[PDB]
Amino acid sequence: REHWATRLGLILAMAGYAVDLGNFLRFPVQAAENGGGAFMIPYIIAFLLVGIPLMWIEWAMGRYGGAQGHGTTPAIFYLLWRNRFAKILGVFGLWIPLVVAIYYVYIESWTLGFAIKFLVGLVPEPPTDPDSILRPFKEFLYSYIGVPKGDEPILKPSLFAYIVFLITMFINVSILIRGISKGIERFAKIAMPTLFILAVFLVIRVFLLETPNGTAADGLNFLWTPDFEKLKDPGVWIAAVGQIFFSLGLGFGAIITYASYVRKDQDIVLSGLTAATLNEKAEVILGGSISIPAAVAFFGVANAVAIAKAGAFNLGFITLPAIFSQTAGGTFLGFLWFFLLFFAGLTSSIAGMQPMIAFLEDELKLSRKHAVLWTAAIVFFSAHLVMFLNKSLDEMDFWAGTIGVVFFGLTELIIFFWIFGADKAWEEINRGGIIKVPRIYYYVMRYITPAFLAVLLVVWAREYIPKIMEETHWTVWITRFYIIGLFLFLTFLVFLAERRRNHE
Ligand SMILES: CCCCCCCCO[C@@H]1O[C@H](CO)[C@@H](O)[C@H](O)[C@H]1O
Ligand SMILES: CCCCCCCCO[C@@H]1O[C@H](CO)[C@@H](O)[C@H](O)[C@H]1O
């Protein structure tokens, strides 16, 4: 079995997985909308009661499975729980990262695409008033994706958008086809420092921004001034547990697969703790210091609330580019911003395709070359649904990327800590540990952690599921049809895997 070469590479690959577009866009907007500095109260709590416990569990499950030659959840769930229904539930840990990969690599390609257009100067140059600057960039983005100009839910990506998508797939395959240590690990050691340098340079330049409408301090102010009155709102605590769960990328099946390349007795308690921390530092220090302070510096604290309400996507793909076109050296600034996001995306997409590659390798005994190429093929082909059908992206992100991961997160806890056995699980987590998990966490993992996840799931099921089902366009059935098929197809592969094993 392949293994991580160095402890540092392992930590950087894992941190690379967690640190994504969300760190620099989603988190700052969530924080501004949910109590500013006060949001750190339920955020740290969520990190301690949900994020850290579950992450350790996923590392343990991954390492446990890897020792027996299995890096994915159909095989691993079966090992923790010998039942046919365990295998079926395990398919989700293969299906979720696959579906997310199907739209996420495309989004990732947008940033590479924007980075190049900025570098070579193929971007709008307004002219005045805020809308006079924002609109040409709104239009730039819309022409790239091919946002529908009519009533048809049809997208028309530019040739440039399409070729960059091809290039992006090529880069992913390039890394993945070289394997865990010589490919993913080697790349983490380059991308993670590069990421840090870009962010630090941006944080510095943002902190020097001064306009007639405000400064970076005004931005940092608005973001971090606490609003403790929002702590009463249940949705703020849900937001925190939600934010933590998603920032760490728990429930995607990715962490388990990566951990399966950790050796049987190699530490996971400290390594895991360090990786989660890197994500957090990247999130609150760097992520919170770039996008919101820059936006508020240019548009003024008066529009801060409006900016936060406009969302993470608009901030990163419309608002900030517009600001860069109005600032000195903003052309090279825009390149750095989108290059930064691209590496943030790239370190995450490789991790998210690895479970499929691992499954093809571990269970169907494919060579790495074939496993990577076929995985790329399924992802490349399927992505045409995301590129051409409007709102397809949102549908996949809801079922797989939102509802799915929380359900799968809860499923992992129960199978490992309740079915497999809390005591067997506890020893599994601490074995080889440079540090030992604090004894209090034995109760957290068994009762508190699943309780939190259950509450989150129910609130979200009650809140969002009725809306998506009753108020959406008929074309959503196209996306549902396709991803349900993917689940059927994966089930078949799991079926073929167990049959091959019975023969040999
Ligand atoms: C943290 C960054 C997350 C990236 C969010 C990507 C969501 C963009 O998604 C797309 O945006 C287009 C522009 O409005 C819309 O026309 C499409 O309906 C939508 O699918
Ligand atoms: C059924 C699979 C067909 C997938 C078609 C993908 C290629 C079509 O591509 C289309 O044509 C233009 C150039 O070709 C580009 O502007 C865009 O990529 C796209 O709109």
Ligand SMILES: O[C@]1(c2ccc(Cl)cc2)c2ccccc2C2=NCCN21
């Ligand atoms: O960027 C992701 C991610 C997860 C899986 C893949 Cl295949 C690609 C990207 C992501 C997407 C959507 C919601 C949450 C998350 C996430 N958490 C860490 C990495 N990561």
Ligand code: NA
């Ligand atoms: Na993150």
Ligand code: NA
């Ligand atoms: Na990443």
